[PDB]
């Protein structure tokens, strides 16, 4: 049904009302109290609601529009209009000139090369603010979601037919930055992201951006005083993944599982359903063999009059007795089976369901 | 002409009227050799290649994942089994998952599961071996005149070259380890790296035949299953302090040689002097080493003649062959003010 079969499952009981629990992702807690229904609390989602894209780092870029300008000695340095264009990365050098290549004078003449930079593949850096954290909790009764914010810490949700439950939950994001790649995400420190050796631009959502620190992926190397060649560093994707293997990984969506939530349940106004129902007088049919759920508890699958209480009793060689994990089992329809979770009887005995089937296990 | 506009230029002269001259050639540089009554030569190292190399390894820098396969079992039913677990194309991992009625199991417990991914490489690099015997130096010898290649192997070190109309030159070169280094070849560039350094690179590799088998695939695929991504940029970063060469054989560095000009013959010594006036066809200019180039044209129906020159000549025996075709003369002027006289007339003031 739910919360059954989960390995990291906690059973918490109301003290001699209120119930204190700790929810963690991938885990479920089953709480039980005197005269109160047994419910399953599970932390479904923990999200960052709205994030601002602060930077876009370029991990793979391309080069277009290569332009060159050379001058003879005694004519000064070369000049390109593109040196002022921020789409271009440029560098000056000096090359051997003379009569042989069109100069009246022999010497080293200035040369400038500019390449137009375009990013093909990029990653994003988003900002997380503590007030935009949104935990999602789901509450289910043994045969209703509520969202929790640091702004709205206490949540009152209504469980149909059982009353209303109260949830008082209590959970440095401004000093961390969420680094987003193709579909993954990591939580890293602000300064480290700021010092990443990759060209970046600020994601103003406007196309044809202006990239800064372009020299970190485009550099120049001049060979034997007769040319200048422009090189691209290549895809820094794997370098990023390697550098981020030790950072805290989340799932991207913006689902964080690096956070737990301690809550307090108020069952004062909780009412137990089916106290005015009659008992079922007909027979139950074993739908499945009973099995043990890793915690000693046993699951009994039965199929069925009216909405009724399910008669459940434990009798030894001679003499009956009354412990159920599923509180007040009720058959709502004859067509739909019901699963019953029980605390196993110690010592071989007769487990009677109805008024009836006999099962030992 | 040649060897003049180059900044990395060496002037070596046969000492006290000698016929042999020892020089050292390096790429991007040119050497000017001169001897008494011998033509001035320009020696240049055109190419330095490694002839035939064996690709020892192939490193995978970008790979892809295809055909993910899964096998799960309920508790008390044993381990999961996939046929690909023995198949060397696949990287696999075993784990345990919570199973029960919810996932189709009669019993509640941790059931075994195996996941396998098929590895395929998208873009690769090579690690090749260079052997000292496959080195081939290419040298080019030219006569320095205003108006011939030899190949050298550590096997055939000494070369006799023919200069047309000028005789024969002797070259005794000596190539100046490759056993402990490996050449890393990428998309079109290559670097010289130590053998152990290449061997300890954390990338999946194979020695191949296509449709290969890759080793150490866990260096790019681990366990949800993830790919580490293109390690191209990481490699380029790792080689910033390396020696960049070009691959196609492969083009790589220095060469110490000895030139024997004993049998080299100088042409045009029997011509007479020109007695008419010379006309400056181009402005005289100083080279990166103090020498000056003078482009002149002769005026007067003389014959092929010696150009009267007075102040040391870099260009040996300047000769006007026709009045219509100009001649370029290179001379080394003395440091400080001096008069360059061309003819017997043009007078030029240099500093």
């Amino acid at each position, epitope marked *: 049904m739910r919360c059954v079969g989960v390995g990291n499952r906690d059973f918490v009981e109301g003290l001699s009302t209120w119930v204190d629990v700790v929810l963690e992702h991938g885990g479920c807690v089953t709480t039980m109290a005197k005269n109160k229904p047994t419910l399953d609390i599970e932390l479904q989602k923990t999200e960052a609601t709205q994030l601002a894209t602060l930077r876009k780092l370029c991990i793979e870029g391309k080069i277009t529009n290569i332009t060159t300008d050379s001058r003879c000695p005694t004519q000064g340095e070369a000049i390109l209009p593109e040196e002022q264009d921020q789409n271009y990365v440029c560098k000056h050098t000096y090359v051997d000139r003379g009569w042989g290549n069109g100069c009246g004078l022999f010497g080293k003449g200035s040369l400038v090369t500019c390449a137009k930079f375009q990013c093909l593949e990029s990653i994003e850096g988003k900002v997380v603010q503590h007030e935009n954290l949104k935990y999602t909790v789901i509450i289910t009764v043994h045969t209703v979601t509520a969202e929790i914010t640091p702004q709205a810490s206490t949540v009152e949700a209504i469980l149909p037919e059982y009353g209303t439950l109260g949830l008082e939950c209590s959970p440095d994001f401004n000093e961390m930055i969420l680094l987003t790649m193709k579909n993954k995400a990591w939580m890293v420190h602000r300064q480290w992201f700021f010092d990443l050796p990759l060209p970046w631009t600020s994601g103003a959502t406007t196309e044809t951006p202006t990239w800064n620190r372009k020299e970190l992926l485009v550099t120049f190397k001049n060979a034997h005083a007769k040319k200048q060649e422009v090189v691209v560093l290549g895809s820094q994707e794997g370098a990023m993944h390697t550098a981020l293997t030790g950072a805290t990984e989340i799932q991207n969506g913006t689902s964080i599982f690096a956070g737990h939530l301690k809550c307090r349940l108020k069952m004062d106004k909780l009412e137990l359903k089916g106290m005015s129902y009659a008992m079922c007088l007909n027979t139950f049919v074993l739908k499945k063999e009973v099995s043990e759920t890793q915690h000693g508890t046993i699951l009994i699958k039965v199929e069925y009059d009216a909405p009724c209480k399910i008669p459940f009793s434990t009798e030894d060689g001679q003499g009956k007795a009354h412990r159920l994990i599923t509180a007040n089992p009720v058959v709502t329809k004859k067509e739909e089976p019901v699963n019953i979770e029980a605390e196993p009887p110690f010592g071989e005995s007769n487990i009677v369901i109805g008024i009836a089937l006999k099962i030992n296990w | 002409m040649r060897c003049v506009g180059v900044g990395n230029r060496d002037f070596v002269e046969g000492l006290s009227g000698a016929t042999w001259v020892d020089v050292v050639l390096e790429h991007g540089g040119c050497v000017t050799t001169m001897a008494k009554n011998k033509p001035t030569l320009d020696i240049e190292l055109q190419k330095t290649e490694a002839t035939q190399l064996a690709t020892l390894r192939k490193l995978c820098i970008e790979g892809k994942i295809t055909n*993910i396969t899964t*096998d799960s079992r309920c508790p008390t039913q044993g381990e999961a089994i996939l046929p690909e677990e023995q198949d060397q194309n696949y990287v696999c991992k075993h784990t345990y998952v919570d199973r029960g009625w919810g996932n189709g199991c*009669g019993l509640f417990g941790k059931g075994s599961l195996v996941t396998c991914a098929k590895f395929q490489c998208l873009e690769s690099i090579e690690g090749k071996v260079v052997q000292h015997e496959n080195l081939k130096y290419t040298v080019i010898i030219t006569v320095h005149t205003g108006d011939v290649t030899a190949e050298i192997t550590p096997q055939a070190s000494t070369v006799e070259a023919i200069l047309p109309e000028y005789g024969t030159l002797g070259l005794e070169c000596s190539p100046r380890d490759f056993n402990e280094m490996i050449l890393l070849t990428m998309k079109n560039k290559a670097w010289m790296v130590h053998r152990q350094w290449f061997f300890d690179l954390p990338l999946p590799w194979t020695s191949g035949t296509e449709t290969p088998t890759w080793n150490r695939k866990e260096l790019l695929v681990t366990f949800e299953v993830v790919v580490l991504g293109s390690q191209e940029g990481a490699m380029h970063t790792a080689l910033t302090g390396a020696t960049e060469i070009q691959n196609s054989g492969t083009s790589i560095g220095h060469l110490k040689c000895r030139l024997k000009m004993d049998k080299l013959e100088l042409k045009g010594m029997s011509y007479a002097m020109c007695l008419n006036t010379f006309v400056l066809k181009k402005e005289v200019s100083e080279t990166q080493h103090g020498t000056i180039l003078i482009k002149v044209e002769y005026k007067g129906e003389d014959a092929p003649c010696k150009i009267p020159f007075s102040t040391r000549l870099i260009t040996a025996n300047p000769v006007v062959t026709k009045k219509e075709e100009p001649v370029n003369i290179e001379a080394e002027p003395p440091f400080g003010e001096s008069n360059i006289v061309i003819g017997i007339a043009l007078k030029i003031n240099w500093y």
Partner: antibody
Amino acid sequence: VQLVESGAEVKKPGASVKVSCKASGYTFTSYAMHWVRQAPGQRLEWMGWINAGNGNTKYSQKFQDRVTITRDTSASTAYMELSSLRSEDTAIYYCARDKVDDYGDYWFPTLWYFDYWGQGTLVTV
Amino acid sequence: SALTQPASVSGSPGQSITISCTGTSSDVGGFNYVSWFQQHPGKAPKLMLYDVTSRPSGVSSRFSGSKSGNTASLTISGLQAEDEADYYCSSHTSRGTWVFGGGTKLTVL
């Protein structure tokens, strides 16, 4: 809960067909969408499924190269595209739903999988 | 097909009938993901049984199921004229796939 499939199409061998499956009456992103075809007079045959919450898919080895299953969350509609069509592909194509877990993942199906089926799209090649 | 069903099944109205579904230890002998669908001519299959014994709320109790080893079976008691149709069993495999039975043509005499 209702599943609506696109109309019948007729194509020539070698072409491709793209049939749609629009969901109504339930949260589209909380259910995986499966595709099953049935040749005339033959049994049901499973082609693959898509997790509508995150786009994760998994195909049958018989259809893994020619089949592409996609989704439009804004349209709450799943798509099945079969390319390189053959005369054998003449069949009725159904879609069938199954629920995902609470974390949006689909590793193990529910026991009541394929509980709702679309009317079916006839594709003749 | 990985699951084996009888080709054709017939019975008199009001009788009880059983259609078997034999697979392997990796589909039916391994997991309880055994389902039964009914397909009337021209219509889509309708889920009749799941979790070998269980049946949807809308489905009548006349349909019951059982499983032993690698063989499951759908039993229909008190046969009616509406039940004449094709019946398909299905199973989730150990390799994360789905397999269907060959189909059984149920005819009401």
